Amino acid sequence: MNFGLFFLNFQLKGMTSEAVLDNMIDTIALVDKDEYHFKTAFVNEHHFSKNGIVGAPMTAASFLLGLTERLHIGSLNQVITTHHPVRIAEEASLLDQMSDGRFILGLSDCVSDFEMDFFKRQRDSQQQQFEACYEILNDGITTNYCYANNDFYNFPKISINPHCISKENLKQYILATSMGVVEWAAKKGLPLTYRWSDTLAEKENYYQRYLTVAAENNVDITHVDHQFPLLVNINPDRDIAKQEMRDYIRGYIAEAYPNTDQEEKIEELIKQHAVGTEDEYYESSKYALEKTGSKNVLLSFESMKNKAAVIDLINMVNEKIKK
Amino acid sequence: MNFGLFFLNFQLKGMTSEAVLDNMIDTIALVDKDEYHFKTAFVNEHHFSKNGIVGAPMTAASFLLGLTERLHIGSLNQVITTHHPVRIAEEASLLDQMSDGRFILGLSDCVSDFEMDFFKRQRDSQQQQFEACYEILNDGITTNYCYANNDFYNFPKISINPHCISKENLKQYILATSMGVVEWAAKKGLPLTYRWSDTLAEKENYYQRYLTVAAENNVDITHVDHQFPLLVNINPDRDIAKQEMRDYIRGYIAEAYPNTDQEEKIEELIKQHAVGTEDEYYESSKYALEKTGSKNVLLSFESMKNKAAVIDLINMVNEKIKK
Numbered sequence: 001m002n003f004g005l006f007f008l009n010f011q012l013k014g015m016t017s018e019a020v021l022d023n024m025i026d027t028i029a030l031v032d033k034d035e036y037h038f039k040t041a042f043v044n045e046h047h048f049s050k051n052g053i054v055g056a057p058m059t060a061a062s063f064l065l066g067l068t069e070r071l072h073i074g075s076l077n078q079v080i081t082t083h084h085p086v087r088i089a090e091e092a093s094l095l096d097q098m099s100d101g102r103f104i105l106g107l108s109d110c111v112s113d114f115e116m117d118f119f120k121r122q123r124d125s126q127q128q129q130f131e132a133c134y135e136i137l138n139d140g141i142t143t144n145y146c147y148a149n150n151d152f153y154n155f156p157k158i159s160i161n162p163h164c165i166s167k168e169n170l171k172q173y174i175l176a177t178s179m180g181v182v183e184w185a186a187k188k189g190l191p192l193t194y195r196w197s198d199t200l201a202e203k204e205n206y207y208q209r210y211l212t213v214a215a216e217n218n219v220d221i222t223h224v225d226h227q228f229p230l231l232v233n234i235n236p237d238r239d240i241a242k243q244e245m246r247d248y249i250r251g252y253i254a255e256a257y258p259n260t261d262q263e264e265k266i267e268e269l270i271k272q273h274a275v276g277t278e279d280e281y282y283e284s285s286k287y288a289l290e291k292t293g294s295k296n297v298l299l300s301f302e303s304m305k306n307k308a309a310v311i312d313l314i315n316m317v318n319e320k321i322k323k
Numbered sequence: 324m325n326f327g328l329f330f331l332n333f334q335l336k337g338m339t340s341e342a343v344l345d346n347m348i349d350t351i352a353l354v355d356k357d358e359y360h361f362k363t364a365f366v367n368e369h370h371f372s373k374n375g376i377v378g379a380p381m382t383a384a385s386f387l388l389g390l391t392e393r394l395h396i397g398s399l400n401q402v403i404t405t406h407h408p409v410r411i412a413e414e415a416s417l418l419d420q421m422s423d424g425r426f427i428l429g430l431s432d433c434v435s436d437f438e439m440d441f442f443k444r445q446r447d448s449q450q451q452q453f454e455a456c457y458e459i460l461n462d463g464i465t466t467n468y469c470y471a472n473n474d475f476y477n478f479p480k481i482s483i484n485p486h487c488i489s490k491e492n493l494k495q496y497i498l499a500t501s502m503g504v505v506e507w508a509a510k511k512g513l514p515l516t517y518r519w520s521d522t523l524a525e526k527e528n529y530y531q532r533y534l535t536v537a538a539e540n541n542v543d544i545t546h547v548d549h550q551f552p553l554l555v556n557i558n559p560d561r562d563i564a565k566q567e568m569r570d571y572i573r574g575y576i577a578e579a580y581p582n583t584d585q586e587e588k589i590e591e592l593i594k595q596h597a598v599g600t601e602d603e604y605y606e607s608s609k610y611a612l613e614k615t616g617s618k619n620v621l622l623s624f625e626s627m628k629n630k631a632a633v634i635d636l637i638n639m640v641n642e643k644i645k646k
Contacts, residue, residue: 017485020421046484047413053484055413060381063421066389083410084442090370090378098386118478119407119474155441160339161369161376 003321004040004227006076006298008196010248011050014117020053023302024060025067031314032068037321042076042106042229042298047115051252057106058091059069065099074104076193076229076298077175081126082119083112085133085153086160089140094163097272101166105141106193107134108175108231111256127180128152142167173227176206186213189221196229197249197256199265200272200288202309203228211227228294230285233303234313241304245275248303324612326644327363328354329399329552329621331519333571334373346625347383354637355391360644365399365429365552365621370438374575377566380429381414388422397427399516399552399621400498404433404449405442408456408476409483412463416487424489428464429516430457431498434579450503451475465490496550499529500523509536512544517550519623520572520579522588523595523611526551530615551617553608554596557636561599564627568598568616571626601639 011017024043024144031038043060046052054060057075064073080088095103109130110116116123127255132152140146140160164170173193174185185192192210194203207226214221231249235241246266253265274282289297299317301310330347334340347564354361366383381399387396391554403411418426421583432453433439440447447606455475463483470480487493496516508515515533517526521581530549537544554572558564569589576588597605612620622640624633 011484017420018488021417021485025421048481048484050484053486054417055484056410056417059382059385059414059417060421063389063418065597066386066391068389086441087379091382094344094379094382095386098348098383112324118409118481158441161334161371161373161378162344165341175640186535255441 001143002040002225002296003038003258003286003317004036004042004296004298005043006042006196006300007054008044008046008052008300008302009054010252010302011053012247023307025064027301027310027314028064028068028071028073031309032071034070036089036314036318038318039072040104040296040298041071041073042104043073045079045108047112048118049251049255051255058088058095061103062091062095062098065095065102068102072102072104072171073099073266074171076106076173077108078106079108079110079115080133080137081130082115082121083133085136086140086146086155086158089137089160092137092141092170093160093162096164098163098171101170104171104173106173108193109177110178110179111195121321125151125250127184130181131184138172139168139310140164176203179206179209182206182210183213186210186221187217187219188221189214189224191224191226192239193227194229194292194294196231196273197253197265197269199268200284200291203288210293225295226293227296227298228259228289228292229298229300231269231275231303232299232301232313233275234278235304235306235309236277241275241277242270244305245270245273245303263278325363325548325619326361326362326387327365327619327621329365329367329519329623330377331360331367331369331375331575331623332377333575333625334376335570335574340376344380346630348387350633350637351387351394351396352390353634355394357393358607359641361641363427363619363621364394364396365427366396367399368401368431370435371441371500372574372578374578380410381418384426386419387641392426395425395427395494396422397494399429399496400431401429402431402433402438403456403460404453405438405444406456406531408459409469409478409481412460412469412483415460415464415493416467416483416485419487419489419493424435424493427494427496429496429498432500432504434498434500434518450501450507452508461495463487464493480548480611481555499526502529502532505516505529505533506536509533509544510542512537512541512542512547514547515547516550517552517615517617519554520575520592522591523607523614526611527614533616547616548618548623549616550619551612551615552621552623553611554592554598554626555622555624555636556596556598557601558627559600564598564600565593566591567628568596568626597632601636 043057045057061073176192192235233245366380368380384396499515556564557566
């Protein structure tokens with residue numbers, strides 16, 4: 001099991017944008033020192049509300065890459081369906097070059113009908129646009145050349161500067177947002193990142209469909225390293241840890257999952273992730289990792305309001321990784 | 324006179340993309356140390372050839388900002404006419420927060436008909452699209468809200484995250500690319516960045532048009548700090564320095580100024596900039612600064628083939644800055 005971090009950067013009531021971003025920056029600076037065994041760190045993308053104040057994860061990763069020396073840093077869910085593939089390919093190659101191969105390209109389809117309207121993207125052809133955008137973006141990263149002649153993009157062959165050194169070995173991840181995307185990803189043998197806010201059953205169902213589609217297409221997925229973003233809030237008072245987590249995720253659940261039972265969605269997430277005391281077992285989270293084929297686990301302690309307890313927790317996790 | 328740096332990142336024959344980008348990174352790391360009196364550093368944008376291998380100057384500035392603590396760093400010519408204004412506003416506010424107010428937003432209109440076709444932008448409305456795009460990004464940077472209802476952008480009112488602290492005090496510069504842009508910039512009292520590859524007469528004509536339009540509109544321009552990017556190549560052999568500069572700019576001149584006399588254009592640039600020995604006077608470059616109202620000068624030593632001679636020159640300039 002590989003360990004890493006991920007940051008949602010939620011700006012709750014009374015918090016300032018500066019405090020939220022300072023927390024990410026200081027946590028990554030601390031974990032980047034050699035005594036730690038976390039290997040990766042990811043930045044989440046969100047627009048148009050305080051439930052995630054980072055709208056450009058590759059730009060944020062760039063700053064963090066300039067600030068660090070050991071960690072590999074990247075985007076968790078760079079939405080390509082509302083962006084331009086040539087521009088993303090140019091940024092990925094630049095970060096690969098400037099950071100000496102430490103940038104990770106986590107990708108995502110669009111999951112907000114509002115954003116599809118905002119950026120003038122057709123809803124009914126969304127899946128086809130996601131795949132056309134990926135082919136252009138993947139061409140540029142692995143061959144340093146882009147070309148398009150289809151119903152979404154049409155332009156002559158051009159070179160992508162700077163030239164990418166990693167090429168096919170630049171790590172890419174796909175956010176599991178629908179069966180169409182998961183099946184598309186299985187045929188390409190690309191690793192999945194699961195939506196943190198989804199239910200455990202949803203993630204397990206995605207993984208089982210991923211296994212089925214890969215087997216039908218004779219795709220070798222023995223070394224595909226799926227990723228599980230895990231929210232963590234450990235407090236000696238079980239009620240303190242459970243309430244801080246409810247105050248952290250409630251706004252986003254109402255925003256991103258409006259047609260669901262709000263209260264059940266929240267409670268299911270408290271069970272799935274790690275919210276409790278230091279002496280609990282969290283077998284629901286261990287079950288979650290195993291049954292989704294996740295070989296990387298990404299931690300976020302951002303709901304905990306005591307920063308000294310967070311540093312204490314990071315060191316405890318780090319020591320067990322050494323063992 | 325304020326001093327700074329700018330980087331064109333030309334990848335000449337035989338050079339690798341890594342060597343070019345390592346030069347910028349190491350030069351900025353050295354100059355950021357406290358003993359230096361350079362204040363700014365800028366990254367140039369270019370696409371689809373090796374005459375400038377950085378396609379995302381704000382992403383490159385982000386990395387450099389993470390690497391440094393003192394210098395203010397930004398884009399030299401972020402083209403807004405082919406980009407989305409809401410995305411730029413989100414990135415600028417993000418960089419303002421993460422770098423503690425050290426990001427500078429140098430902007431530019433599009434100067435390549437190929438790029439206008441590539442990104443599906445109408446040529447006849449280029450000037451009007453440039454102005455509609457600026458209003459959206461400038462609204463978001465100074466008020467954290469964007470709204471549009473015109474023939475280029477139409478979307479409901481949304482907030483820009485993260486919260487921008489600098490707002491109106493976030494320095495903006497406008498690349499002097501045409502009379503239409505210079506006049507538009509004069510009415511807003513915004514400072515100019517001159518195209519390095521233009522003739523001296525062209526820059527003086529831009530400045531004189533800027534003074535005229537500002538006077539006609541009762542705009543206070545007494546403290547507007549225009550910027551002059553100056554290429555530098557100092558070598559004990561005057562003929563070596565002139566050849567290294569000829570080999571540096573020839574490709575770009577052929578690319579960006581195809582319908583002009585190539586040889587006259589190059590020689591005019593050799594006269595305008597600082598290409599010679601250390602004991603020469605360079606009164607043509609001093610005249611250039613004075614007659615363009617430039618209060619900031621940006622230096623680039625990238626044509627010199629001896630990197631140790633470049634550092635020696637940087638120290639010589641630095642000592643003269645502190646008198």
